[PDB]
Amino acid sequence: LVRDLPQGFSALEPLVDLPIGINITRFQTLLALSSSGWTA
Amino acid sequence: YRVVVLSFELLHAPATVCGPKKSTNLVKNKCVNFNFNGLTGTGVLTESN
Numbered sequence: 358l359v360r361d362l363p364q365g366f367s368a369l370e371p372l373v374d375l376p377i378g379i380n381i382t383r384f385q386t387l388l389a390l391s392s393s394g395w396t397a
Numbered sequence: 398y399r400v401v402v403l404s405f406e407l408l409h410a411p412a413t414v415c416g417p418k419k420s421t422n423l424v425k426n427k428c429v430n431f432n433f434n435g436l437t438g439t440g441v442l443t444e445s446n
Contacts, residue, residue, distance in 0.1 A: 376411040 390397070423442065430439045 376413055378410050 425442055428441055
């Protein structure tokens with residue numbers, strides 16, 4: 358399919374757990390990219 | 398004297414470091430008492446399909 362958030366069922370196998378224990382409230386992603394022009 | 402002091406910090410995070418663990422040979426078709434990695438039970442350990 359092209360763009361629509363697809364309908365259909367799947368699952369999610371685990372990747373990893375980590376003992377961290379920190380105050381968490383927010384998250385931002387990162388994107389690969391020049392500034393005034395690029396190709397993607 | 399060269400002195401090394403192994404102090405530690407505990408009781409403020411999930412424990413992460415400690416000693417090794419024992420390992421023994423398995424056996425089948427006999428009522429034994431297994432302790433598989435968290436599971437302490439008794440019975441006969443055959444193989445699976």
